[PDB]
Design a protein around this ligand. Structure first.
Ligand SMILES: Cc1cn([C@H]2C[C@H](OP(=O)(O)O)[C@@H](COP(=O)(O)O)O2)c(=O)[nH]c1=O
Ligand SMILES: [Ca+2]
Length: 129
């Protein structure tokens, strides 16, 4: 897998963000994770967490996996990095997302994310509290 550049257009919620990629606006859904909706418990905290992380980054990157790059709603499916740090992983470490939506062929960073989730659960952070 390889990282590619992108620029923030707008934060949307915990696990979706609008980015400019190859010069085009696109909504990105984070691979392998699930944040609560904004109207659900820990949803506002998830949206805040992602928003802060993407807005403060000097460098946003996109990393596609080996399978489909777009979901059925036209959202790109990627791992997103903020100054070298994976937002998908950071959310899970904080107990602000669960590992979810693990489909075959787009699951390269599954076991990395599971390990973060196990550490979040041990700490009884946020979603695990
Ligand atoms: C994360 C992800 C979600 N999706 C689809 C499955 C879910 O379908 P349904 O909408 O039919 O429930 C939906 C969950 O996304 P959200 O958690 O943003 O709603 O997005 C994919 O198809 N591939 C993925 O990798
Ligand atoms: Ca969600």
């Amino acid at each position: 897998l390889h990282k590619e550049p992108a620029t923030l257009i707008k934060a949307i919620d915990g696990d979706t963000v609008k980015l400019m990629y190859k010069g085009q606006p696109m909504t990105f859904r984070l691979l392998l994770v699930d944040t609560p909706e904004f109207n659900e418990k820990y949803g506002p905290e998830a949206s805040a967490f992602t928003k802060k992380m993407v807005e403060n980054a000097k460098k946003i990157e996109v990393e596609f996996d080996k399978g489909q790059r777009t979901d059925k709603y036209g959202r790109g499916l990627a791992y997103i990095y903020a100054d070298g740090k994976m937002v998908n992983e950071a959310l899970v470490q904080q107990g602000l997302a669960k590992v979810a939506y693990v489909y075959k062929g787009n699951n390269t960073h599954e076991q990395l994310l599971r390990k973060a989730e196990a550490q979040a659960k041990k700490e009884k952070l946020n979603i695990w509290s």
